[PDB]
Write a protein that binds this ligand. Structure first.
Ligand SMILES: Nc1nc(=O)c2ncn([C@@H]3O[C@@H]4COP(=O)(O)O[C@@H]5[C@@H](O)[C@H](n6cnc7c(N)ncnc76)O[C@@H]5COP(=O)(O)O[C@@H]3[C@@H]4O)c2[nH]1
Lengths: 174, 177
């Protein structure tokens, strides 16, 4: 299926590569690049999984972009020093800072949305919802048995006055 | 199907983003005379599509010699600000002498197909892999044929496996202006 391939590519080509190094990158940021009065970046990659596949290019009102982690580079598929970058976000609640975390949308959901938009893909909006859920289930089952493993990332799936900050804060507060 | 999603993934999240800016990046590189004294970088992105899905991480080691990187291109995508896209320049040797210079890379989704055939949890046989790899290439060509970003700035190089010369494979396409 469509979602089966997207989920395995998200793991094979991304999570498997950046999860084993995420802990070292976050500890580097907290010790050197963090401003004096800014909070420790929580561990773990928080992955946003909107089932409607609505992915804005700019995630950054209670979610404010702070900074980027140090880059991770590697050679892949003949591209020398392919760069992997992640963004740190501040989470506001009642005007007060409630958390800071590495946060991003699952990029394959943008592919599912584009396929529903383009007639040549032959892919309906109903197909999109079924495949989005199937993507999330496959990714969870992959991570459950993955050595790089689910303990470096949290999947935040949700369907849609929904508040995205409160959704992430609920996961960030255990 | 598996290949259907990977092809659209390759177009939506990569080719449609870098192909419209590729010509201007190569031109800027060729405008520096110390770069050009090596040899000029040909236009177009040359995409290697081995049907067996054997994709090494280092193509230079695998008559194909890494030269330099093309200046990076950045953009904001899915909440990752200033995501970095990079491409590499290779010179192709023939009888010990440089015969061509081009931007060259494997299609990264073929490594997903390979890894799926390797992992039992994917439920994906080697027969499945060959079928989907051919479906991937056809679906990618049909997308590029109708893509406004267009296939006039990229070349697909599909092949399988006697001595096989990848450098000669690319050189045959590179010499077809
Ligand atoms: N050669 C090459 N250089 C690149 O910079 C690049 N960036 C993307 N792609 C390929 O285009 C297609 C779609 O791009 P994504 O949705 O962003 O990647 C999807 C995306 O779900 C995720 N991902 C990969 N790199 C990521 C990154 N740097 N940041 C966030 N997510 C990423 O993991 C998938 C597999 O990645 P790749 O298997 O490396 O190949 C991709 C894919 O085939 C690239 N291909």
């Amino acid at each position: 299926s469509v979602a089966h391939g997207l989920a395995w590519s998200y793991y094979i080509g991304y999570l498997r590569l950046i999860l084993p190094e995420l802990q070292a990158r976050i500890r580097t940021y907290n010790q050197h690049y963090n401003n004096l009065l800014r909070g420790a970046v929580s561990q773990r990659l928080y992955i946003l999984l909107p089932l409607d596949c609505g992915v804005p290019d700019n995630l950054s009102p209670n979610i404010r972009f702070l900074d980027k982690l140090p880059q991770q580079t590697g050679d892949h598929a003949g591209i020398k020093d392919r760069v992997y970058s992640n963004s740190i976000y501040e989470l506001l609640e009642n005007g007060q800072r409630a958390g800071t975390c590495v946060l991003e949308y699952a990029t394959p959901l943008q592919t599912l949305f584009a396929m529903s938009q383009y007639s040549q893909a032959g892919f309906s909006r109903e197909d999109r919802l079924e495949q989005a859920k199937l993507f999330c289930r496959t990714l969870e089952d992959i991570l459950a048995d993955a050595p790089e493993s689910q303990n470096n990332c949290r999947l935040i799936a949700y369907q849609e006055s929904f508040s995205l900050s409160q959704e992430v804060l609920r996961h960030l507060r255990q």
